[PDB]
Design a protein around this ligand. Structure first.
Ligand SMILES: Nc1ncnc2c1ncn2[C@@H]1O[C@H](COP(=O)(O)OP(=O)(O)O)[C@@H](O)[C@H]1O
Ligand SMILES: Nc1ncnc2c1ncn2[C@@H]1O[C@H](COP(=O)(O)OP(=O)(O)O)[C@@H](O)[C@H]1O
Ligand SMILES: Nc1ncnc2c1ncn2[C@@H]1O[C@H](COP(=O)(O)OP(=O)(O)O)[C@@H](O)[C@H]1O
Ligand SMILES: [Mg+2]
Ligand SMILES: [Mg+2]
Ligand SMILES: [Mg+2]
Lengths: 84, 49, 97, 371, 371, 371
């Protein structure tokens, strides 16, 4: 049962995850891990495709304290004043 | 030979060392992803606070 | 033995295969029955629109809520991590000598 | 908006605004924790003293230096140091002020990673930069070309620059400065009978070194003069009232900068480091490095060091060409001063690491945006 | 309208005004690009230094020569050189003054094509002319007949002219001049241990060659004198203050002109080139070319070249006919002086290449107008 | 009698007998002097350890390399090295055995003069010879034509030979090899926190470079792989029990051979050095030099260098000629092995430098007999 291949097509353009794809006949060996996944009684996790389609798709196209000094001399005066 | 058939690699070209190094890097990336997710959630909670 | 009898690693491989079959539709790489071991290293290449969240971070973010048993995955891969860097040829040659 | 300069060196944090003459908050970088049993209850017994309070109350405290040879080892202590120098000394909000930090060259990269991440996620700024201290010392000197020897409390580093161009292969780092001089002075004051073992007594030995020590012009003649007559001996008063009098340790202690084999280091002195840094450069600029030997840091504040290093380089350089040490009277704070001109420069405003660029690029922009 | 004369030779660009006796702007043809990292922000850090500024700041620069063996390899660098010699040195508008140009014989044609295209589409003059350098040297010599050996920095070429008629088949070209001498001098200085590998150090070896090297009158006897006694050895001062001493390498460097097998070339020497250039001419006109060996170029500025040239030609030629070398003291600028003589002539005004002629004929009229 | 071959390279001295296939005595060329204070009297505390004893006892020693970039800087140290390799390692009498020595091209001549004088007046052989290392490597390869790149620890030199004829003008020397790689690996290992400053730690960094480093086939893709994942990181065990792990520094360290601008040198890579050595030759022989690129030296022991060399030369050369890299598995000792080929040939026996020739001609017969 090809449960891994039964995926809906996406609405938006997706960022391509590059990988080295195996041949199919190599993947259908007797001792293969993918052969054990191909049994339908194995444990399968359903992904939430909505958030993956949401995020990984391509993007498209006041006078409180008035002073007459500058800030440097005022803060130097604050350091001078608050130590008293 | 069993792991060569298991991971669907060529038996005469499989080395166990690069296999275990790929698993080591995958575990390091796994722990770094969990740590970055925890730091991101903690900083998002602190920013919301 | 830990790689051959891992339970959560085929679960994660079917999860990334379903995500890639969603994600690489319409290309030559899609509709795959399997892939190599080096696919897990490239998972940080697929970034979000904000260049903050990679696909690995989002998969573990989804796995924290729905299927937490994937967080048991470093326990199975601890012994491959300890076994990495060990050259079998030099110790077998030393044992034979 | 005005900018902040904070030379967060190994020994003394020097922090202040931009465009100012003198650094407003100069205080040593120590975290003090109590080591005895407190029997009194009430009236605010703190578990950690940072800054001048740790200096005043040092007789019941273990003092830890969070920075060792320019590399921050303990990071919660450095978090408390930054918290004290922002909130308590300058009394400023770091969320509305840009900040220029200083860094020694040939530092481990994860140290810079953690400086960027803690500085952008605990004390989150609009902008922050990490600069080389020797470039700021050349900014303070008012000249474009020159070789800069900086010597703080942990790092003595040599960087040569010609017409705005630093040569990265000629930059040299030596982990020998005033803390190693202080530890060697603690080793050699035991010869005269005075025992200093605690971290609080390191401050007293540091005060002895700051107040009495001087760089000899000729070492062997000064040893012969101190061995012959007690004219070079000088006295100092301890906080317990005892009066000490020291002799050759006034000039044996700063001689470790010119002779690193005193503390067991294989590497050559600062004069050989300066000469090798000049000789590693291209040939046509070397004359312009001989006449512009800029000195900085508090370790070069002994009143015999300029003539001595002029003598050593003049012995090392070819004799047909002038040697001139640029030793300003305010070379203690020159890293902060050149940070204040660079923070006030109009062209520097495009070179800030903004918060948006940090969020886009992770903590990895500081390798490619800074030096 | 005063014309401009701009000898764009391989070695140094010599530009100035017509009718004058000395060129106003003599400056070397290099482009200097910085290679190290700039740290000091502001103060106009140019990305390419051209001419005298590249020479005076060469310790931080990679220097590129736009001409290699008489052929312009890099054209953007030559556009920068022409912009520098028009706008910065003479400070004249090119669109109101004619500009004469010089060129070596047996040049590939596309160099002349792109010279025509750039001087009428980027530096568009009212008129220009491209001339053979040897014809200009004979015009500055003030005689109608003679054979000119012109040796610049890339091309050593022999051209005979009799009564204003230049024989084309006897014109010879050899790709051995002053840059190859400088390359060989950097090769043979490694015997004495002085490793000159950078492009900046090539200018230092060129200054050594200009100040100290000379053509030997006999080569084996100067081996005997140099190997026997250290009387010929001369010391030189490097810009870092180091002093070198060279011995036989003073005269081993120009003997590549008289023996091209030193740098692995099958061709014969410049004296044999001159003798075969004379012998390829008619039997009637050889007598005047024996007595009028005019020489020009900076490679003819060694103080032993004329007597050696006379000795080798008198050994080669039959002894009944008179051999004479015409070596004026201003033969370095004689290409410019001949261009200034030819530009101010009244008969030259119909021989200009106009904008209208270029527009009707493409960039191909330079083959049918010039020689 | 049976001759000796003694490759006295910058890093490792390889000595052995003629007519043998493997060098009998391979040991590194260092002189170790103690720098700490000896307290236990007796038990034969030597003041200078040479060879493997300096390697085993390096934690209390200053190690000096007597050869720097193929040039012997310290001559007493190399006298100690020759005394150790004759009397202790090989256990031979040098006065009754000819000895073949190896030397890099474009060397200063006074180095060859002092080797001739010392080996005829301190280690007085019946006969000897001084040979170019590339010719010995080509004789080890069993072929007559080819271009040899030889990269030891101080010198990387390219020599092309066609039918036994070596073209001297195409020989190219570059002072970049394994010691500069070790110093650059010291400079880049400080990024990960591992401080290696002593001369003893240079051997540890060299062992890291020998055991873990490799030449990348494509540098930018390998940087992208190292930035992406930590799969190609590898761990090494220090002698104190600490385990380090290095990543991109496995291939950034040998990339300095292909990109010399990492350590500030202006020169081009070894592939461009090889290509310019080929293009300086005649046009008829280059097809023989493309197909026979012989490599030698320990700097070609990285297990990715031949494919990268073939890729870079195939990118440089025209595609209609075959690129083949001759990389035998024993090309580390091939400089020895071809010497053991050359010392045992019958036609070499008249080419020896006898003692009578040295006595009649001074130490000047080595310039006229050796190439
Ligand atoms: N007047 C002085 N004379 C001699 N040494 C001094 C003097 N002032 C300070 N020092 C030494 O120099 C150091 C100050 O240099 P500085 O660059 O401020 O260090 P940091 O910035 O790492 O705290 C102190 O550790 C002190 O030991
Ligand atoms: N006084 C001198 N003595 C020896 N060589 C000189 C002297 N002046 C210049 N040269 C050499 O001659 C060259 C200048 O020749 P020049 O006629 O200007 O050539 P070009 O015009 O083709 O560049 C310089 O490259 C320099 O090396
Ligand atoms: N297995 C190896 N892998 C990488 N580099 C090596 C290896 N073995 C030796 N080297 C490097 O090559 C050099 C040895 O080359 P060699 O020509 O023998 O040097 P020398 O003869 O000058 O001592 C050493 O300095 C070492 O750094
Ligand atoms: Mg400092
Ligand atoms: Mg010229
Ligand atoms: Mg070698």
């Amino acid at each position: 049962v090809p449960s891994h291949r039964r995926v809906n097509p996406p609405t938006l353009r997706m960022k391509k995850l590059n990988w080295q794809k195996l041949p199919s006949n190599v993947a259908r060996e007797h001792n293969s891990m993918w052969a054990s996944l191909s049994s339908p009684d194995a444990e399968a996790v359903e992904p939430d495709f909505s958030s993956i389609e949401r995020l990984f798709s391509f993007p498209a196209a006041e006078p409180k304290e008035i002073t007459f000094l500058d800030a440097k001399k005022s803060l130097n005066l604050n350091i001078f004043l608050k130590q008293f | 030979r069993e792991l060569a058939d298991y991971l669907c690699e060529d038996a005469q070209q499989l080395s166990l060392e690069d296999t275990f190094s790929t698993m080591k890097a995958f575990r390091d990336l796994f722990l770094r992803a969990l740590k970055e997710n925890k730091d991101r959630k903690e900083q998002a909670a602190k920013a919301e606070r | 033995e830990s790689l051959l009898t891992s339970r959560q690693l085929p679960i994660f491989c079917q999860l990334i295969l379903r995500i890639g079959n969603f994600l690489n539709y319409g290309s030559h790489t899609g509709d795959a029955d399997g892939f190599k071991i080096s696919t897990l290293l490239k998972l940080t290449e697929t970034k979000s629109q904000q260049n903050r969240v990679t696909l690995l971070h989002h998969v573990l973010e989804e796995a924290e809520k729905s299927h937490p048993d994937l967080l048991q995955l470093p326990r199975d891969l601890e012994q491959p991590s300890q076994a990495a860097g060990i050259n079998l040829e030099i110790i077998r040659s030393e044992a034979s000598s | 908006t005005t900018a902040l300069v904070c030379d967060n060196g190994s020994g003394l944090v020097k922090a202040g605004f931009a465009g100012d003459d003198a650094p407003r908050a100069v205080f040593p970088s120590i975290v003090g924790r109590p080591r005895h049993q407190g029997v009194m209850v009430g009236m605010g017994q703190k578990d950690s003293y940072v800054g001048d309070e740790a200096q005043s109350k040092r007789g019941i405290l273990t003092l830890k230096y969070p920075i060792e040879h320019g590399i921050i080892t303990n990071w919660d202590d450095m978090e408390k140091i930054w918290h004290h120098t922002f909130y308590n000394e300058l009394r400023v909000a770091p969320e509305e002020h840009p900040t220029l930090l200083t860094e020694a060259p040939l530092n481990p990269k994860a140290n810079r990673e953690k400086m960027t991440q803690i500085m952008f996620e605990t004390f989150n700024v609009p902008a922050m930069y990490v600069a080389i201290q020797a470039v700021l010392s050349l900014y303070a000197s008012g000249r474009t070309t020159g070789i800069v020897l900086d010597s703080g409390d942990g790092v003595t580093h040599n960087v040569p620059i010609y017409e705005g161009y630093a040569l990265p292969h000629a930059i040299m780092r030596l982990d020998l400065a005033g803390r190693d001089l202080t530890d060697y002075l603690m080793k050699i004051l035991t010869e005269r009978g005075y025992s200093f073992v605690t971290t609080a007594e390191r401050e007293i030995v540091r005060d002895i070194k700051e107040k009495l020590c001087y760089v000899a012009l000729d070492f062997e003649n000064e040893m012969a003069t101190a061995a012959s007559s007690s004219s070079l001996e000088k006295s100092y008063e301890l906080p317990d009232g005892q009066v000490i009098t020291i002799g050759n340790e006034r000039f044996r202690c700063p001689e470790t900068l010119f002779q690193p084999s005193f503390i067991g280091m294989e590497s050559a002195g600062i004069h050989e480091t300066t000469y090798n840094s000049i000789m590693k450069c291209d040939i046509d600029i070397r004359k312009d490095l001989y006449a512009n030997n800029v000195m900085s840091g508090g370790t070069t504040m002994y009143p015999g060091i300029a003539d001595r290093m002029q003598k050593e380089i003049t012995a090392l350089a070819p004799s047909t060409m002038k040697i001139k040490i640029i030793a300003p009277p305010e070379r203690k704070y020159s890293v902060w001063i050149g940070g204040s001109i660079l923070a006030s420069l109009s062209t520097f405003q495009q070179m800030w690491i903004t918060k948006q660029e940090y969020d886009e690029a992770g903590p990895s922009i500081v390798h490619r945006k800074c030096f």
